[PDB]
RNA sequence: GGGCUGCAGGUCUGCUGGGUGGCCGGUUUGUUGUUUCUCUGGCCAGCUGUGUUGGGCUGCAACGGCUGGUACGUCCCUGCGCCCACCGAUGGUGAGGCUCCUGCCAAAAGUCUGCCAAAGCGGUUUAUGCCUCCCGCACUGGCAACGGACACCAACAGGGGACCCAGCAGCUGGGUUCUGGUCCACCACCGGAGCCCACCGUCUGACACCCUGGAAAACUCAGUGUGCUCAAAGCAUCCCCGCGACGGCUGAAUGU
RNA sequence: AGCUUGACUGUGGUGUAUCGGACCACAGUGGCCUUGACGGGUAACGGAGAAUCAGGGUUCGAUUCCGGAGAGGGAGCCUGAGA
RNA sequence: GAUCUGUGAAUGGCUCCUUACAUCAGCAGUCAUCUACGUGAUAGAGUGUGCUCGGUCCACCUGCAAGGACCCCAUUGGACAUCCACCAAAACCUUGUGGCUAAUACACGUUCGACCCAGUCAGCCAUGCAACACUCGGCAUCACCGGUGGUGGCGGAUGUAUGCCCAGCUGAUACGAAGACCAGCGGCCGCAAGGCCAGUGUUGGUUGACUCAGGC
């Protein structure tokens, strides 16, 4: 339910149910504008929000929307000096594991699987408590107990937004920042190769 | 809150709008000094 | 021996109240309340003096302390209350509903209102501080504190304030143009949007006011008060003569025909 | 010369921790070479003087490395003489005008005043001096500028 | 300092020794006749309109009654209107800012006497329930929005979903929407030029005097209004009503 | 016609509701004066004001309003927000 | 009626002896201060250590790092007045004693009026260079093996209310250009190796002026 200047309730893929299309207008007190736009359409605002304006009509799904399709993972409140390779030990019997990103500044990590059904399962993996690795033989605070979300967040799509935001950069500065880019790969090797010559 | 929430709202205007000046001088003069 | 002196001869009383010098010797010494006391009116002289419902003293006290003169939507049962400039005065027994301003002449009127005018308030913030526990407060002219104001509001801004709960409404800045009335000095009662400001630090500030139909005068800073953001728009309803003041001659032909056309009958 | 005083107590600035551990660059001035001093620019159109933000003297009643403030009138008068420690006299010698005849008559008025040790003065020079909290006896008054 | 285009008089120019009255400019006073216009209270069509009663107010208008019946252009002097001499500034930030201009080249004609505009041409430029940041950190938040006329089907490029398949949110395909034909109006963001305010910095004598403004106890003094019987006073009075009522306008200026 | 010796400034304290030689300890030698200091006089409480007043001024103001002081002369206090 | 308590008696009224920059008038300052009545707001004290420790009841060993059972909350105490009685004194708007009896007097008392967070104490985790320092353990300073260090986190105990006093910190800035490197911390490309810098939000009132207000 999207509610920024203009309400739209929805209620399944294409106009299948559509019952609620004329109630909502005719209805005096709740809402003068009318219900239409291939999905129902208000641009009024009462001291409610969907939390509980879905219940408020109690007649329908309420549930356009995309889930289910994510082929990442996001997990959540993560212990300090985690890795990326123990979140692909914590996260290998999901399924075979294509790319984790590692958030410490937030304490949480992002994992790429390679299929969207390893994703699911993994959400249902949201039981299992957390190990670095070591085993449950031993039992301390160690179990973290994380939480798992799904991602629409790709390899392909961060790439896509990677160099759209290094292109949003301006055009004149991006060059001036490479010949920055330049001096720092040459002055680099500059006294390597007078390091092992020198010698 | 009322504080806070200003605050918040002049960040997030104040970066709107440089953001909004960054692709809007750098992307005019882009196609100005193409052709 | 000395302390605080509890008397005020009817000679020293503050001669915007029209007191007459032979109608006894004290006056009602303003109690220290809101208001200052030359920049107040006493509930005894707003009830009976101007409102005759108290035929004396003792009828003033009677009215006062029966619980039912309303004074900024709260009862007020001394009778030397110090009600001052733009309080609002209700007597529900009588469906009486005063704001208290000033006239061009630089006294106290009782300005007929009605419900919204009534139910609401105006007052102008002259400090600005922070007391323990870093609460940003700013006291007004009525002394009152709005222990937490926006922090867009600077000192000499006016306020609306909502006489039943107290809290703060709106408010107006005192920036060039917003309508504006004096409160002191010669040209008190006056009303006039602001034109300029002279700075004069460590010293008073002069406002240049225009009037409404074209005079300019000037004052202090701490002598204007804001009542509206424009001419326009009064926060407030405002008397007769708008405050517009006349010419003296202006004035004298306006009696000689007022007191001609009455004897005409 | 008046930067000197007596050598019975260690004469420090009040609001200068002199033996902070981790300092702040706040009262490290642009111009000093690193010695933090407190000071302050009294505000009715006048000048910190530089002597005054740079020096090292120590000066309650100085006006402007000191907790004293400047407020009320501000007057205008001529060294007699400085023969006092940091006090200093000034004349102003002012006209009266007598109503009846419709003259002037020659009025003055003396003041001891309280020179900080960030002014160079000789006797004779103008002096602008505004009022302070009473100092002394007769010195209500600090200088807060020197003219030559 | 030269000056003088340009208002009245003076340099100039020719005059005037006639006796009443009403009408008209303007409303001048007691009158009516409006009601421009708020305001007042209900009714009436789901608090806004709609006519209305009451006094307010006058766009005013007449009725007796009325009173009020020196000239152009020319040599210059002030009040202004000008042309013609020579050599306090700058820097930041906002304000719960304003104004103007604002996509490309530019005919002729226009300007300074090779630079530069005005102003049409041409297409390159722009239209969502949408987009953008966030997408599980808060983000149902922030950002961004410049039309019609004529009347026609269909291709196309791009975006979007719910169900199912093959391999290393992807393609692979198939199972319910927004722009294609022209004219005028526009022209966003970005930016440019001033102006106004508030604050924060750097550098090159002080006063009398006069003017203007701002500040300032009352009583007294002066002074405005007012028949306490007048007066000295006082700050009050005044009007309607008298047949019977549940009141009205007020004033207490102002000054030295 | 010379006056002043806490007299005048300073540093550090004290005390006060608070600044201050207000007091103290230590330093210095200042401070005012013919533009009348210091002293003396009171047909001296001060002012708002009063009487005259062409103008300029003259004289008065114990007395109602404001300020001060006092309560037979001095002095010391308690209570209290305040003596 | 009386009495205790509260509050007023510092205002008013009188007089002009004193007093010559003194008083006073007008102007101004308090950024050097005090404040009953009045008025507008406010207000969270079991609180000297993390705990033992608000009070009792058990534990362990020159105390502990996670351990408990109850109790407090229907609100305290002791006086002296008015009163009764015996009275001292010539009186006195002088006064003693004995017995009751009140509180918004006086004393005394305060859980549930907080919650959370900071902070303080303690423990634990993941990962990383390293043989340097200081040590616990064995010897009378020449000496042989462990421990702590870096980074990122989690957390068990409590959750120090406020005034005065002292010290420290803050109470900003409003003018301006670029690089390298070594540590650590992010983020990017990255399977990783390694390289790298495109992202990048997760502390300031008042005044003309403050050592002021406020806060730690």
Redesign the interface.
């Known amino acids: 339910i999207c509610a920024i200047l203009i309400r739209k309730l929805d209620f399944e893929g294409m106009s299948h149910e559509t019952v609620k299309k004329v109630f909502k207008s005719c209805g005096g007190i709740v809402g003068v504008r009318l219900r239409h736009g291939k999905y129902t359409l208000i641009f009024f605002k009462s001291n409610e929000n969907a939390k509980k304006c879905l219940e408020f009509n109690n007649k329908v799904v309420k549930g356009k929307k995309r889930e289910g399709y994510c082929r990442t993972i996001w997990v959540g409140p993560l212990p300090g000096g985690t890795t990326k390779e123990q979140l692909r030990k914590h996260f290998a019997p999901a399924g075979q594991v294509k790319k984790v990103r590692y958030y410490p500044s937030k304490k949480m990590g992002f994992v790429y699987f390679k299929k969207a059904e390893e994703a699911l399962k993994a959400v249902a993996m949201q039981d299992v408590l957390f190990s670095h690795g070591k085993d449950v033989s031993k039992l301390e605070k160690v179990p973290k107990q994380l939480q798992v979300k799904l991602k629409i967040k790709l390899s392909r799509r961060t790439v896509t937004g990677d160099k759209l935001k290094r292109e949003?950069?301006?055009?004149?500065?991006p060059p001036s920042e490479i010949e920055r880019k330049e001096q720092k790969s040459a002055a680099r090797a500059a006294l390597r190769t007078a390091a092992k010559a020198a010698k | 809150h009322l504080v806070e929430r200003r605050k918040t709202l002049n960040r997030q205007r104040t970066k709107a709008a440089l953001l909004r000046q960054v692709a809007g001088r750098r992307k005019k003069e882009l196609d100005v000094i193409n052709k | 021996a000395r302390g605080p002196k509890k008397h005020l001869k009817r000679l020293a009383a503050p001669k915007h109240w029209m007191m007459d010098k032979l109608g006894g010797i004290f006056a009602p010494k303003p109690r220290a309340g809101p208001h200052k006391s030359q920049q107040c009116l006493p509930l005894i002289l707003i009830v009976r003096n101007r409102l005759k419902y108290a035929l004396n003293y003792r009828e003033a006290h009677m009215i006062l302390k029966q619980r039912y003169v309303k004074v900024d939507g709260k009862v007020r049962t001394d009778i030397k209350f110090p009600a001052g400039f733009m309080d609002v005065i209700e007597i529900p027994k009588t469906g009486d509903k005063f704001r208290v301003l000033y006239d061009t002449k630089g006294r106290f009127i009782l300005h007929k209102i009605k419900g919204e005018e009534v139910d609401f308030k105006l007052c102008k913030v002259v400090k600005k501080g922070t007391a323990k526990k870093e609460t940003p407060y700013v006291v007004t002219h009525d002394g009152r504190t709005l222990r937490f104001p926006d922090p867009n509001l600077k000192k000499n801004d006016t306020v609306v304030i909502d006489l039943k709960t107290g809290k703060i409404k709106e408010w107006v800045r005192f920036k060039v143009g917003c309508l504006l009335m004096v409160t002191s000095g010669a040209n008190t009662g006056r009303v006039g949007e602001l034109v300029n400001r002279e700075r004069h630090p460590g010293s008073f500030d002069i406002i240049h006011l225009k009037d409404a139909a074209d005079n300019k005068f000037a004052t202090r800073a701490d002598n204007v008060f804001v009542i509206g953001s424009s001419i326009y728009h009064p926060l407030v309803s405002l008397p007769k003569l708008k405050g517009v003041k006349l010419s003296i001659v202006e004035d004298r032909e306006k009696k000689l025909a007022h007191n001609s056309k009455k004897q005409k009958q | 010369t008046e930067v000197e005083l007596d050598d019975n107590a260690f004469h420090k600035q009040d609001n200068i921790f002199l033996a902070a551990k981790n300092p702040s660059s706040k009262w490290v001035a642009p111009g000093s070479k690193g010695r933090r001093r407190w000071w302050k620019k009294i505000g009715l159109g006048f000048k910190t003087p530089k002597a005054a933000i740079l020096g090292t003297y120590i000066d309650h009643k100085c006006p402007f490395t000191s907790k004293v403030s400047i407020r009320g009138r501000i007057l205008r008068g001529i060294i007699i003489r400085h023969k006092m420690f940091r006090t200093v006299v000034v004349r102003r010698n002012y006209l009266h005008y007598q109503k009846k005849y419709k003259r002037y008559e020659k009025r003055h008025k003396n003041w001891s005043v309280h020179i900080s040790p960030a002014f160079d003065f000789s006797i004779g020079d103008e002096v602008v001096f505004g009022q302070c909290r009473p100092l002394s006896k007769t010195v209500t008054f600090n200088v807060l500028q020197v003219v030559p």
């Not at chain 1, 949003?168 to 500065?173: E, G, I, K, S, V």
């Open positions: 949003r950069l301006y055009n004149r500065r």
